[PDB]
Amino acid sequence: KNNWVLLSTVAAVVLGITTGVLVREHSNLSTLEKFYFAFPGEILMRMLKLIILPLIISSMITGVAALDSNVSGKIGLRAVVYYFCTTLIAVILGIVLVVSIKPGVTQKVGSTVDAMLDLIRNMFPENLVQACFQQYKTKREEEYKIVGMYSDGINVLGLIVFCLVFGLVIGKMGEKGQILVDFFNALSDATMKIVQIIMCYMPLGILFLIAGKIIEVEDWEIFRKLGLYMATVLTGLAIHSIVILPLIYFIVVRKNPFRFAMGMAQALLTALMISSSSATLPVTFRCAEENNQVDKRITRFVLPVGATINMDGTALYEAVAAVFIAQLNDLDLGIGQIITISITATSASIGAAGVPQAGLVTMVIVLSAVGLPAEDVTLIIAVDWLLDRFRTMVNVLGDAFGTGIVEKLSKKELEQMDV
Ligand SMILES: N[C@@H](CC(=O)O)C(=O)O
Ligand code: NA
């Protein structure tokens, strides 16, 4: 006998790939019947979006309140240093692989500052209740006048920053704020038993979410016409996730880095099918502390920050595809043009959201920094549901890897706290 959570997810990926392929050659469903066929996949998607509001709020508060305000200053320093030393590696390895393969040659025919100041405008929102379901976006229009309105989508960057300050303030209050530690420890425990309820619906939801995703129009543009560009994204996503990311784990932890990746198989295959790192963040919490036994004082702090900051698969896909877009023209892309690609792609992966297809929002930022037009992204929009699924597994794995690396780097400080 074995565990039924992972063996039924693998059985639902197989039964969902073989369903969304067979119904195309056999039948011809209309545009309205292809939306009701993926309806159990939509219910799973909005059941996971539902739970990230009490999960991020309660884990960010009790993750920092359990540390005595100077241990948390070094867990926070060893997290941002790790996130910068993997994003830059995933950018550089995607830069080297895209100018040596050269996928874009002889196949051509076939508001950056306003987007970066919206990261700081979203870290300090004007309302806490409005930050739970609405984001702030700035447009420039008329000699121009800056005017911003409130769009939709949960402001995850503003709830992390406020609960980090709320977590530090509560932990320094002592006995005067002990009832707020017990409230958000009982809330983080109650909204992890709900994740174990959604995890029983997940094989039935994936089986229709991935069958209604490969049910699309043309399998020829993804395969051969835009071919050998996906052989630079998936190649860079392979070497970074199989070789490089279990080499950063093996250097600082001598504890078998593929035993950690095998123990995170539920969170890896969830993001491989739902294509959103923020929505699978409840799966990453459960599949790390229960399987790999990484300490709860670190995963409550490292994993929510890494889900919206550390996005290595997006950082490699930004550095590969923006050069490939410039390679469809006859641009030289000299030594000055390479480094400015590698700089804004590090910031675009930071500014990218954990929503599905957030990959093409921040592609305008890196493309306009090199001089390419924004409407030259329309060549990439065709195959984006498949390249978004492999760059979310890597993003999730990177976050999972961080929990184990920061824990061995701070084994003394966790053992410092005693009775
Ligand atoms: N939802 C995707 C967005 C992206 O491509 O960055 C992810 O988290 O990986
Ligand atoms: Na990173």
Ligand code: NA
């Ligand atoms: Na991430």
Ligand code: NA
């Ligand atoms: Na990000």
